[PDB]
Design an enzyme around this catalytic site. Structure first.
Site: not given
Ligand SMILES: *C[C@]1(O)CC[C@@H](OC(=O)NC(C)C)c2nnn(Cc3ccc(OC)cc3)c21
Ligand SMILES: [Co+2]
Ligand SMILES: [Co+2]
Length: 370
Positions: A231, A143, A256, A223, A154, A351
């Site tokens: 996000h 990812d 995703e 998201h 993403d 995703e």
């Molecule tokens: C795609 C993903 O990384 C995972 C799914 C989603 O996160 C959640 O649903 N979390 C819950 C509250 C446990 C999500 N939301 N944004 N991303 C992308 C992402 C977020 C943060 C990060 O580094 C800090 C990298 C990528 C996701």
């Molecule tokens: Co994502």
């Molecule tokens: Co991703």
């Protein structure tokens, strides 16, 4: 004409001298509940002009998406058991930096390379010293993100070597595709989740003589995406029972989905590698010198984009963990630890990023691969 090298090294921007990057997959929006089609958007004059008015934005997403396609095809050519997770992420990132023509906050890596293994679904990248080696039986979620001008792609896929996981990957791929097909302007987010779950749970898989019904991971979600904002605040469920909030024209979503042979719920586990400034927190004066310095480094290099400890290390920072903890405790930075289902479970992910354009739905990160 300028052509990509093998291995890839030529910036996407140099492959398109005219500055116009390739569209992803364009889709008529789904029929509304009436049975009425969305074919009217395709030609309509006011929508066409509203679409054109954001053309420079879509073009930036497209540049980032082309980089993502080229990087991932390269990765799939060489990722193999025996490699360390660190070697895998470094090789991936080196290529991504070159192809996106990294330039501070103007063009770069949008977030760390996820390479979550087995029961761990998301938010694992190795820190310094991690000796983890990719195994034949591993199920590895790659990812990674690219951006141009904070227009983020993403997009993620699952890597396996043992064919025992083929149907688990097929299930989650189909579920993601279903979610992407369902998505549209004025579509209720809860309906997307219900559709994803119906597909995913239509699959059964057999791994090492045990059978499972594939479960969506209920507390992981798609998201919306905003400028420099991975996000942006709208969540796309992958199970039934969510919010009836609607998708809107001009929004960008990461659709995703995650499937599991475990509980279908993740919890925090293992050492944290991923962090990101809280988008809503403004300027906070800091006098503590190591903490002030680290915050400055984050603001200069990442802004509101996510980063990892390895990316600090590469900038020459050391012995920064207490300063990083301080920033977390102050609420300026948030930690994003690995998210894992129960021991012994297997998780998979696909995703894509989609643009809800006035004239059509564009699966901007679609490739010939997935
Ligand atoms: C795609 C993903 O990384 C995972 C799914 C989603 O996160 C959640 O649903 N979390 C819950 C509250 C446990 C999500 N939301 N944004 N991303 C992308 C992402 C977020 C943060 C990060 O580094 C800090 C990298 C990528 C996701
Ligand atoms: Co994502
Ligand atoms: Co991703």
């Amino acid at each position: 004409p300028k052509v990509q090298t093998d291995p890839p090294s030529v910036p996407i921007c140099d492959l398109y001298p005219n500055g116009v990057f390739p569209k992803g997959q364009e889709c008529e929006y789904p029929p509304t509940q009436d049975g009425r089609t969305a074919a009217w958007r395709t030609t309509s004059e006011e929508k066409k002009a509203l679409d054109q008015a954001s053309e420079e934005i879509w073009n930036d997403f497209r540049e980032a998406a082309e980089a993502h396609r080229q990087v991932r095809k390269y990765v799939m050519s060489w990722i193999k058991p025996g490699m360390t997770m660190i070697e895998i992420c470094e090789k991936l990132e080196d290529c991504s930096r070159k192809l996106i023509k990294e330039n501070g906050l103007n063009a770069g890596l949008a977030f760390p390379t996820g390479c979550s293994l087995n029961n761990c679904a998301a938010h694992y990248t190795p820190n310094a010293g991690d000796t983890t080696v990719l195994q034949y039986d591993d199920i590895c979620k790659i990812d990674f993100g690219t951006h141009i001008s904070g227009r983020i792609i993403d997009c993620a896929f699952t890597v396996t070597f043992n064919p025992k996981y083929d149907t688990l990957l097929k299930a989650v791929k189909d579920a993601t595709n279903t979610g992407i097909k369902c998505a549209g302007i004025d579509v209720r987010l809860c309906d997307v989740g219900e559709a994803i779950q119906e597909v995913m749970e239509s699959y059964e898989v057999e791994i090492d003589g045990k059978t499972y019904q594939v479960k969506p991971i209920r507390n992981l979600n798609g998201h919306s995406i905003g400028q420099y904002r991975i996000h942006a605040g709208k969540t796309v469920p992958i199970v039934k029972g969510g919010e009836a909030t609607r998708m809107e024209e001009g929004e960008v979503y990461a659709i995703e989905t995650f499937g599991s042979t475990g509980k279908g719920v993740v919890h925090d586990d293992m050492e944290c590698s991923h962090y990101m400034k809280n988008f809503d927190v403004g300027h906070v004066p800091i006098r503590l010198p190591r903490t002030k310095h680290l915050l400055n480094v984050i603001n200069e290099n990442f802004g509101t984009l996510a980063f990892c400890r390895r990316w600090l290390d590469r900038l020459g920072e050391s012995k920064y963990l207490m300063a990083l903890k301080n920033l977390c405790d102050l609420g300026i930075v948030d930690p994003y630890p690995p998210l894992c289902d129960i021991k012994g479970s297997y998780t998979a992910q696909f995703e894509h990023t989609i643009l809800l354009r006035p004239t059509c739905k564009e699966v901007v990160s679609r490739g010939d691969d997935y």
